[PDB]
């Protein structure tokens, strides 16, 4: 009953793969249902066509800044930063899916995925999915970042959806 998700990423425009999440709906219903609208782009913005603007190897991944490109942007479908929901998942290990804030109940579109288990911040950042196929994408867009997070290539959702 999990939604599952779905990102084309390209590194400078060329084709690298596919990354699926499964959606933790049954847990953090609103968090999920965020993430799932903003991929399938039903309320007319989300992720297609954004970056992942901050990629720290073996840390984590970060995007979902669909309006500022840098991380100082992003929405919620909700008109506003939204609640966080619950801290019952945690930040296990490598392909966890968790929502970046700017501190308690800050929520808005940008999200990570993690590399690395991140224990530090349980309590912190609401952990709502997971990587389920292409984890291996997630590895090779790894390596095209930096120790402070910059790129070295552009690093995009070429196409995003819902799957099954």
């Known amino acids: 009953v999990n939604p599952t998700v779905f990102f084309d990423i390209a590194v400078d425009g060329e084709p690298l793969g596919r990354v699926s999440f499964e959606l933790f709906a049954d847990k953090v219903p609103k968090t999920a249902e965020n993430f799932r609208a903003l991929s399938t782009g039903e ?5 297609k066509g954004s970056c992942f603007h901050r990629i720290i190897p073996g840390f984590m991944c970060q995007g979902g800044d669909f309006t500022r490109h840098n991380g100082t942007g992003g929405k919620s479908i909700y008109g506003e930063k939204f609640e966080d929901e619950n801290f019952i998942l945690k930040h296990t290990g490598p392909g966890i899916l ?4 700017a501190g308690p109940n800050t929520n808005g579109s940008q999200f990570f995925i993690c590399t690395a288990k991140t224990e530090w911040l349980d309590g912190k950042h609401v952990v709502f999915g997971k990587v389920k196929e292409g984890m291996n994408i997630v590895e090779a867009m790894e390596r095209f970042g930096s120790r402070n997070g910059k790129t070295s290539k552009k690093i995009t959702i070429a196409d995003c959806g819902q799957l099954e």
């Open 98 to 101: 968790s929502m970046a804030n």
């Open 43 to 47: 309320k007319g913005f989300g992720y």
